[PDB]
Design a binder for this molecule. Structure first.
Ligand SMILES: NS(=O)(=O)c1cccc2c1c([N+](=O)[O-])cc1[nH]c(=O)c(=O)[nH]c12
Ligand SMILES: NS(=O)(=O)c1cccc2c1c([N+](=O)[O-])cc1[nH]c(=O)c(=O)[nH]c12
Ligand SMILES: NS(=O)(=O)c1cccc2c1c([N+](=O)[O-])cc1[nH]c(=O)c(=O)[nH]c12
Ligand SMILES: NS(=O)(=O)c1cccc2c1c([N+](=O)[O-])cc1[nH]c(=O)c(=O)[nH]c12
Lengths: 395, 396, 169, 395, 396, 169
């Protein structure tokens, strides 16, 4: 018996090196295996035959004649049709389906956030580079001025002045302390500066870590309903645009009001175009499409996307058949037998996951490794300086 | 049906020339006319006034112009536009109950993150606290000096001040009191410093974590005493007369202020006022009808906001020539539509639904913390100068 | 001995600071006035990689008033250069007419003051400049920094020379 | 001409010491002054006469006869009516109004938040009282153990051990450092303890101040639509319940769905009951009523309430008149003349405000005054101890 | 119209005895039957099954019970209830397209603020960081000791350790290196300490500011390896058979785990499972139909949540006896209603709208910080013991 | 001289600690098991201001396992009391059979250990007790605190006596 089908992957697709095979064996895919199982159960023979138009089916507006795969069914050409045929009222009127062998609905696709490895020197981010530079400048200036003032006209020293300033910046105490009024003035001012700077650093770091903590990634459609820095869209015209158009739900009503102000255009001519746009929008763009294709894409390398939240609507792909055919019984019963004994789950996992090309808030060592590297370098430099001093001590 | 073009009430639909009929127009009053017809069940064609004004009494000709002129001279049957109900027009035509209430409001630039001023690092703590800190530092230094000098058990005045200052800054102290009273003073000062510094750091973190842009004015009286932000209405208009014809003193003061204007705090057009406030960088505030203000607050670039509450109250109402056999049904239709929950729907659809507009914090910049650098360099200069002066004095 | 090091360092610091002030190579930023990358400078912003390449002019600088005033009149970098020059002159005048023991002291004072002036000028320049658009600092800025470092080193060396010489008495 | 009226305040009310007056002079109120002005303008004579039923007006369902003030109008008893007569379609059909002399709408009333004066010792709230107690206990224990260990079998001392521990807790440097291994152990452990404790204190204080900063008080109706710790209600049955019932708006639809789950009952039998319920609910209860009464109440002592946000709907109090009367012209024109020349604003300010019985985030000195008091007390104790030591030095 | 009583699908309206007729009942299936009638245009009376079950094949009698029994024996015409479409019933009656899809899901107790454990003060920093801190402390102490001993320019091993430790705790140091290399080491250590402590404090503030209760499990595979939380279905039911009849290994492991149960991780009733999970204090997870789980998550006390995604897929569908002249119209009505945007509306109204449920932080308690107290007392005991041991040793 | 002060303080501390352990007056809290205010104690929670007033019984105590275990067996307060008793006995034994110069040392060691034991017991009690309902602490808790303070003072006094006596040699 002829079997109608279409080439949407990961459903029936062209087997690699198709020249070395012909007929039913010329194609492999989810629907291919499903039809194989159904044939084994009901007990008939079939010859795969792909649709010519490449369209699932729709009533031509000028002429009530159908156009597409359901067209190839309703006019007696085809015996059955195993494909992602979304069952709807118009098709149910003229073509009769079985129980849905695989359920689905509108989902959300977002760019997968790459694990942003913190910079090796991310610990300086709280303060700007200019502030660090001016800190170094001021440290040198204060040390020099303290030396100059205290020295001419005590225990201090350019080396000792630098040591005192460095230890005062880091709040680690000073063995020596100025005994002259001007030295005391400069020391107190340096103390004020270091205190303010350190408090600001700590507070800004706290702000960074707190803000980076109370961020809720888009985990639902309502979360999208309250987002403005991220835009979303659908196909140019399909069941999704119609679903939002005739939507009696408040959240989807708001999203459709948003999409009404479509400028700059969010809609897309082809699904691959939308996937590319999201993959190139750098997390500023989201897409709405069928959950099944979203899950499949989230597994086909590149792994630049993921599915969030849950299904917004409910549909079901179903096995069609000519109205008044003589296969409703066996086909429906075989579908239900397959679903009940867990074959469709196996097959879906096989084609979506098995043959897939993919798949704590405590401060981590990666956030700080810069200071550790600085410390190791300073220790090595200290060992080197000690060796040099030892050699020089020989005189 | 005579209307006027003012947005959003009557505007040219997409493809103003490619769209013909009653679909050439879009806006709030179009939907309102449709809803009024759905009850009246009349036949109408969208129209526009000729002169370009809603309507007014001619200075000398006394010939009604605009929508009122068209209505009173048989040119049109009904009018649907933002007509300000008033006595003068009520004398010649019969309005309906207002389908939208409004009043004078206040328009300002949406406040932004002002560039942090020098000495912004003191924001976390009030100046009262800083003054009390200085006073307590002096007092504790003096008390320690007294106790040390009178019960020696060396802590001079200068060394006492040095010890207290180094204590308040969590730095090492070369000398520590050996007398019990001195130890009491030191421990108390230590507690005070610890608490104060922790509070400073925490409040600074709170400041840096959440931003709160607060408008300088909360109402008309708020800026009636500001005396810093210019505020003026149209050079000649209804609001100017209202302030002029006011009998309440709070608005009398604002009117007097607007009278003594240098430069004249007035404009010739509403777009002029919008541009002025947008380019005045938070120095000009415009008073206009709350409808237009809420409208602008929802249009790009969304650089302005409405503040305060309405000062006066007015209403927009359908109009109809005297004796028309259509005043009563339109009045009833307006009212029933109003309480049916529609005019709110239309206002939301046009003002808000068709709205041009409905964060990882940043590192600190020198602008935030330059004041302490200035203080540091000033202290260095002062210290060099003082050491030089002491050297010169001791030299002689 | 160290007098030669002091003098050559003073000359080098003055040259570096004068070059940095002169060169319009302080900032690398993408601006819109040029209608684009730009090697902005202390005095005149000067375009690059654009239609008006090379054809460049002075800038327009218009509490905060005072910051604009001081930034426009770069009096602090100029003061640092002037103090460096005057300190070098004082060092030269101390090389001759010696046995004063009060000249190189002033030289070091002036060198330190020049360092502080350079620090202040840098702070003011950066604070006023700021007001995401990436940018970078040209070698004029690093020349100013090197001049400050040399000024500090020269001040310390000069005062060390003074204290050694006055330790003779 | 007879004038109908009602006793809702601050509209026409019973003048204090009514025995010493009679007739029109027997009553004072907003509507009284308004009617006085209207009489002066139109030029007729009137005699105030209050309604008997006390009801504004409504169509009896059993019999289409009216019931109330509009009843006193439509049946020829009364000539006009000056009162808060909300103009609606049913009344407009049978009674004819003027232009609204005073506009209004549904508002929100919330308990006024009293200025919570921070406790004099609010600076200890970051840590619990138990933690402070155990800190004191541990400080004593550490000081004693350090003395004991270092002493038997140096420069230290029970007084000196206490001093060292106290200075180590406060991170203010130690004059003396233990030179014995056990002393070093105890010192290091005390150091760890104080560091952890201080960091925790500072962080928890930061959390307090940050949380107390990102609190948005109810400033709109939508803010109420997303609140669950605060409940709200209306009158048992009125124009407000009807407004929410026939509401085609989304926010009010959500609020009406909420009020549908009225348990525990939020509705109220009388407005005074609702005001009392809010005043006793300690900021956990909000009320919805006409903006005018809300503003009036926010000014009548006690000042335990305030109005938030803006009007939710739009209505208007209007001067009624018998259908087909001979006063529409003058009354409407006088109302508009009064409104245009700013009398109604004056009168409203007079009766709502003039005769009313009422009317920064930097850390303030009140938050910290406790430590200042502690410091002053410690200084006084220090001076006393110095005096005692001086007297004892005489021996 | 035969239905079954299971909430929310068919429940007794307010005043079950005082309300008579078709208004005696309320729920989702009531509205669904009304919507189906509004298209079919039939006459129906609400009814309930007698046996008390939806329907099943008798063990030996083979007499259909429940809704299926009533339908197949002429007792009722159509059925509207949460009937799990399946082959066995599809053999005897004709369903419609599913009006609600579902599947097995996971139910747990809503995670709460666990009592802070001892040593909770280390949460801000990962254990890797603590270990690296200790290693760096040891390394820097050793390096300083080497440099001091070999270039003396006294810093012994013990004094070096003391200096480093007092540096890491922002305390005064009695000795400071006078050698340039020692100064290098000290300054580097000082920088490290400053950064580390500031990071600790900031992360702790972040922890205390915002609470994030994270479920321990994110899916079925998540708890398939947990081996800590018990999870079991009904002792006998559809889910038990599904796990038993599974061919996929991830569920095979869970099935084996449920087989070796001690005690038996199973219940006799759904209310039993709900009570168990509510009283198991986050130690039991229940697997049931996602509809019932979403239902429970919206009913008081709201002490539970649904986690993960559906494992299997099923559907609820209208039922109809074979050959009925009403199967096709009801199928079409179900489908048209589904795509018309209704079943979603009803589900929202019943599951969510009629939902039992849709903060000033607190001071720190000893439970948060008791670990450091324990460490302090342990250190005191250790120090007394060590001093005693040294005294005893030196005494002899 | 100070031996008498030490001994009386040791006796007072032991009495205070034994009283605090004995009395069921540690906590004042509003509980629900009583069906109401309650003066809960270390051993038996005992009702107050209720129908079952006076009629009161022991409590039910059921990583955290270990905290429950130690709280139920108040071994640390008991250890503090035992160490206080043993130290007082050691002080008495040092008053007689003197010229040992190693007994009062142990007495002070035991007093310090008792103080630490009391601190640990208090920490454990408070940590386990906690798990808004206002409450307060009865005078049993303050008796324990006073016992700890006296234990510390007695330890320091005893070791001071020891060091003075051993300073004779
Ligand atoms: N590729 S897609 O982006 O997901 C996608 C977009 C739009 C319509 C689709 C569709 C898919 N599909 O899954 O391929 C299958 C499918 N089947 C039908 O029967 C029908 O009417 N419309 C569709
Ligand atoms: N656009 S505006 O800035 O708000 C505005 C400014 C000034 C006068 C206005 C007016 C508006 N309006 O609302 O458009 C309507 C309106 N209607 C009348 O009848 C009248 O006399 N004057 C006006
Ligand atoms: N007192 S109230 O709580 O605000 C209030 C509640 C409910 C209905 C009111 C009403 C008031 N009012 O202002 O007194 C006036 C008023 N006037 C009408 O004409 C009418 O129909 N209903 C009302
Ligand atoms: N309430 S439940 O816990 O989810 C549940 C548990 C177990 C079996 C159920 C069932 C429900 N249901 O949804 O009520 C419906 C249903 N329908 C059938 O036809 C059948 O055979 N078994 C069931």
């Amino acid at each position: 018996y002829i079997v109608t089908t279409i080439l949407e992957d990961p459903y029936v697709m062209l087997k690699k090196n198709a020249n070395q095979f012909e007929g039913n064996d010329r194609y492999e895919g989810y629907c291919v295996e499903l039809a194989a199982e159904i044939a084994k159960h009901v007990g008939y023979s079939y010859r795969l035959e792909i649709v010519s138009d490449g369209k699932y089916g729709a009533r031509d507006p000028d002429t009530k004649a159908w156009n597409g795969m359901v067209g190839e069914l309703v006019y007696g050409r085809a015996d059955v049709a195993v494909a992602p045929l979304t069952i709807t009222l118009v098709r149910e009127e003229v073509i009769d389906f079985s129980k849905p062998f695989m359920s689905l609905g509108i989902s959300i696709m977002i760019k997968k956030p790459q694990k942003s490895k913190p910079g090796v020197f991310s610990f300086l981010d709280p303060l700007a580079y200019e502030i660090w530079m001016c800190i170094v400048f001021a440290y040198i200036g204060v040390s020099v001025v303290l030396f100059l003032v205290s020295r001419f006209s005590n225990e201090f020293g350019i080396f000792n002045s630098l040591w005192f300033s460095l230890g005062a910046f880091m709040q680690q105490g000073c063995d020596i302390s100025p005994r002259s009024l001007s030295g005391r003035i400069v020391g107190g001012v340096w103390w004020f500066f270091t205190l303010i700077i350190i408090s600001s650093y700590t507070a800004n770091l706290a702000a960074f870590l707190t803000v980076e903590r109370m961020v809720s990634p888009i985990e639902s459609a309502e979360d999208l309903a309250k987002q403005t820095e991220i835009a979303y869209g659908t196909l140019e015209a399909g069941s999704t645009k119609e679903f939002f158009r005739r939507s009696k739900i408040a959240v989807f009503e708001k999203m459709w009001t948003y999409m009404k102000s479509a400028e700059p255009s969010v809609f897309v001519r082809t699904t691959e175009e939308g996937m590319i746009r999201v993959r190139k929008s750098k997390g500023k763009y989201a897409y709405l499409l069928e959950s099944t294709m979203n899950e499949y894409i989230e597994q086909r390398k590149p792994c630049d996307t993921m599915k969030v939240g849950g299904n917004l609507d409910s549909k079901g792909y179903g096995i069609a058949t000519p109205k008044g055919s003589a296969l409703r019984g066996p086909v429906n019963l075989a579908v239900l037998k397959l679903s009940e004994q867990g074959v469709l789950d196996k097959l879906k996992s096989k084609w979506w996951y098995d043959k897939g090309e993919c798949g704590t808030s405590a401060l981590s060592l990666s956030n700080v490794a810069g200071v550790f590297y600085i410390l190791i370098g300073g220790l090595g430099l200290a060992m080197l300086v000690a060796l040099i001093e030892f050699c020089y001590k020989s005189r | 049906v005579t209307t006027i073009l003012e947005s959003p009430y009557v505007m040219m639909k997409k493809n103003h020339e490619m769209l013909e009929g009653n679909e050439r127009y879009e806006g709030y009053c179009v939907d309102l006319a449709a809803e009024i017809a759905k009850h009246c069940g009349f036949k109408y064609k969208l129209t526009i006034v000729g002169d370009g004004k809603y309507g007014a009494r001619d200075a000398d000709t006394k010939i009604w112009n605009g929508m009122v002129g068209e209505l009173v001279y048989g040119k049109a049957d009904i009018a649907i536009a933002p007509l300000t109900i008033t006595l003068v027009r009520e004398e010649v035509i019969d309005f309906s109950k207002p389908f939208m209430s409004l009043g004078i409001s206040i328009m300002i630039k949406k406040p932004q993150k002002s560039k942090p001023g020098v000495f912004s690092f003191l924001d976390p703590l009030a100046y009262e606290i800083w003054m009390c800190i200085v006073f307590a530092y002096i007092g504790v230094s003096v008390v320690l000096f007294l106790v040390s000098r009178f019960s020696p058990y060396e802590f001079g005045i200068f060394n006492s001040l040095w010890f207290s200052l180094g204590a308040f800054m969590r730095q090492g102290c070369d000398i520590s009191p050996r007398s019990l009273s001195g130890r009491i003073v030191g421990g108390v000062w230590w507690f005070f410093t610890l608490i104060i510094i922790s509070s400073y750091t925490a409040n600074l973190a709170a400041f840096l974590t959440v931003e709160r842009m607060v408008s300088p004015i909360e109402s008309a009286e708020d800026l009636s005493k500001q005396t810093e932000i210019a505020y003026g209405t149209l050079d000649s208009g209804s609001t100017k007369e209202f302030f002029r014809r006011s009998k309440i003193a709070v608005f009398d003061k604002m009117w007097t202020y607007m009278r003594s204007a240098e430069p004249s705090v007035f404009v010739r057009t509403t777009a002029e006022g919008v541009a002025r406030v947008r380019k005045s960088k938070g120095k000009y505030a415009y008073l206009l009808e709350s409808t237009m203000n809420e409208y602008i607050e929802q249009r790009k670039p969304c650089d302005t906001m409405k503040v305060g509450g309405n000062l006066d109250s007015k209403g927009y109402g359908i109009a109809t020539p005297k004796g028309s056999s259509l005043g009563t049904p339109v009045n009833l239709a307006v009212l029933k539509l109003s309480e049916q929950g529609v005019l709110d729907k239309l206002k939301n659809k046009w003002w808000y639904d068709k709205g041009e507009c409905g964060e990882k914090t940043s590192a600190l910049s020198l602008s935030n913390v330059a004041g302490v650098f200035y203080i540091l360099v000033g202290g260095l200069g002062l210290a060099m100068l003082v050491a030089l002066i002491e050297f010169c004095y001791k030299s002689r | 001995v160290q007098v030669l090091l002091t003098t050559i360092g003073a000359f080098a610091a003055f040259g570096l600071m004068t070059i940095a002030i002169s060169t319009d190579y302080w900032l690398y930023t993408r601006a819109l006035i040029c209608n684009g990358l730009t090697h902005s400078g202390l005095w005149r912003i000067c375009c690059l990689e654009g239609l008006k390449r090379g054809v460049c002019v002075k800038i327009n600088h218009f509490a905060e008033y005072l910051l604009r005033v001081v930034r426009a009149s770069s009096i602090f970098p100029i003061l640092s250069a002037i103090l460096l020059l005057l300190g070098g002159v004082c060092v030269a005048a101390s090389r001759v007419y010696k046995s004063k023991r009060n000249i190189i002291l002033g030289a070091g004072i002036l060198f330190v003051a020049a360092g502080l002036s350079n620090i202040i000028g840098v702070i003011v320049y950066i604070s006023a400049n700021a007001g995401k658009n990436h940018y970078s600092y040209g070698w004029s800025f690093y020349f100013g920094g090197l001049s400050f470092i040399l000024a500090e080193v020269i001040g310390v060396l000069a005062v060390n020379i003074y204290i050694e010489r006055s330790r003779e008495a």
